[PDB]
């Protein structure tokens, strides 16, 4: 039950739970997943159930992959809790390192233009059509959003985006933060 300490020490301010509460959640988690592991498909099922207004399978896959760039295998309880926090709790500004891992689809250490499009598209599919019509014209399709992000970083099509640059830009340029925003409720709310 002391997988809770490293969850807390990894999330810190990000956390919505105490060690005791995490242990309670864990005990319940073990009743459904006694191995303490869940697969990509099982993780996707969680998002499919709780975002019925959206098409969350791609998003949930990228979130699952954020930790290791691997669609195979599993998350442990720690990674599952962190993932739910990342998509659903706290402030985007406390998640920037994790956001880099999300956007670096292949895990090679830099973000490419295509990776931005892939992730932006997956996030876009988390938005209901009823909300999409309220987006600014120049941010109302995945291609427009992804190209705006790339332009804000000053990039040519074949350039690579490093973690240093990503963190600087998402901190400093709040338009970049708005466009890379991956929490579905926050995209909805600033919209
Ligand atoms: Ca990459």
Say if residue 112 is exposed, middle or buried (CB neighbours under 10 Å; 0-12, 13-18, 19+): buried
The experimental resolution of this structure, in angstroms, equals 1.5
| Same domain, residue pair 73 and 124 | no
Final residue before a domain boundary, out of 42, 71, 91: 91
Distance CA 153, CA 170 (A): 10
Is 159 known to sit in a ligand binding site?
no
For the chain, the domain total comes to 2
Q: Token pair 């999409």 is at which residue?
A: 132
Q: Token pair 């949930």 is at which residue?
A: 60
CA-to-CA separations, 112 to 43, 59, 173, in angstroms, rounded = 26, 18, 19
Helix (H) or strand (E) holding 31: helix 19-32
Residue 1 domain flag: no
According to DSSP, residue 111 is labeled B
Q: Give the residues across from 83 on adjacent strands.
A: none
Method: X-ray
C-beta neighbour count of 19 within 10 angstroms: 15
According to DSSP, residue 125 is labeled T
Contact call for residues 100 and 165 (beta carbons, < 8 A): no
Residue 165 domain flag: yes
Is 70 known to sit in a ligand binding site?
yes
| Same domain, residue pair 11 and 87 | yes
Residues by chain with Cβ below 5 Å of ion ligand 1? 104, 106, 108
- Please, where are the H alpha helices in 33-110? 40-50, 57-65, 77-88, 96-103
Residue 56 domain flag: yes
Q: Which domain holds residue 66?
A: 6-91
Q: Tell me, what CATH number does 173's domain have?
A: 1.10.238.10
Residue 190 domain flag: no
Ligand 1 centre distance from Cα of residue 157 (Å)? 14
How far does the chain reach from its first CA to its final CA, in angstroms?
40
Is 74 known to sit in a ligand binding site?
yes
The residues, ordered by sequence, that sit 6+ positions from 74 with a Cβ below 8 Å of its Cβ are 35, 37, 38, 39, 40
Final residue before a domain boundary, out of 26, 59, 91: 91
Ligand 1 centre distance from Cα of residue 107 (Å)? 5
CA-to-CA separations, 55 to 118, 158, 166, in angstroms, rounded = 14, 30, 27
Q: Which tokens in the block code for residue 48?
A: 């499919």
């Amino acid at each position: 039950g002391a997988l809770s300490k490293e969850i807390l020490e990894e999330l810190q301010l990000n956390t919505k739970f105490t060690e005791e509460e995490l242990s309670s959640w864990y005990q319940s988690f073990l009743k459904e997943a006694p191995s303490g592991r869940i697969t990509r498909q099982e993780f996707q099922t969680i998002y499919s159930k709780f975002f019925p207004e959206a098409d969350p399978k791609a998003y949930a896959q990228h979130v699952f992959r954020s930790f290791d760039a691997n669609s195979d295998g599993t998350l442990d309880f720690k990674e599952y809790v962190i993932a739910l926090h990342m998509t659903s709790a706290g402030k985007t500004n406390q998640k920037l390192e994790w956001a880099f891992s999300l956007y670096d689809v292949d895990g090679n250490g830099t973000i490419s233009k295509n990776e931005v499009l892939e992730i932006v598209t997956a996030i876009f599919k988390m938005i209901s059509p009823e909300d999409t019509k309220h987006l600014p014209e120049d941010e109302n399709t995945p291609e427009k959003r992804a190209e705006k992000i790339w332009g804000f970083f000053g990039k040519k099509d074949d350039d690579k985006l490093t973690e240093k640059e990503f963190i600087e830009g998402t901190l400093a340029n709040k338009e970049i933060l708005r466009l890379i925003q991956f929490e579905p409720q926050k995209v909805k709310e600033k919209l």
